[PDB]
């Protein structure tokens, strides 16, 4: 499990919670309980995310949903779409309810889409 | 080619030189030149670096040694080692000539070396 392992290793790193998802669903949860997000439904803003193409932080996100319909009481949060010719094919997302994430995290996100693609 | 393929995802997300090597010499380069680096050995900083297993970050290195011997001005460097089983097998180095090295390149070497792990 490709996705799993990175999402793993972006957690013992950044010690964050880790979401990667392909276009429909969450594929890998690290740091997180795997009840809660894996083969969940993506968010509204998810897939705009990932339509967009370009990567998304929030610093004070306040709540958000990342499974659909489900609004998350939520500190921050950074999304990478990942993209392969030009075409969106999931994202990977990580989250904290207590910490700010930064640029650490937003360009992790990146990197992470950037390889996984 | 695994560590060609990170090192690339790397440059393109950060765009700094980045390096990785195995226990001798530099088996993936991105950013710079395959020619200053590709199959060269590892500086004795690299190998100290890699035995104390801990990450490194210099923000004003001034001159730094990435192959044994080679005095090259720098900037500013972050080196990951790589360990696995608690064996160091390699390391991810981000480096500039002209830029500072911060905390995003520092965790990004963490976890290129732990994913790579």
Chains 1, 2 share one sequence.
Do not use: W
Request: glycine share 6%; with cysteine.
């Amino acid at each position: 499990d490709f996705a799993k392992e990175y999402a793993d290793a972006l957690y013992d790193s950044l010690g964050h919670s880790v979401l990667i998802c392909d276009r429909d669903v969450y594929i890998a949860v690290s740091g997180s309980s795997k009840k809660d997000y894996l083969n969940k439904s993506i968010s509204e803003m998810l897939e705009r995310t990932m339509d967009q193409r370009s990567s998304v932080l929030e610093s004070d996100a306040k709540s958000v949903q990342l499974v659909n319909g489900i609004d998350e009481d939520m500190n921050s949060y950074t999304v990478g779409p990942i993209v392969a010719n030009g075409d969106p094919i999931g994202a990977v997302v990580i989250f904290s309810k207590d910490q700010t994430m930064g640029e650490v995290e937003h360009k992790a996100v990146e990197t992470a889409a950037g390889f996984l693609a």
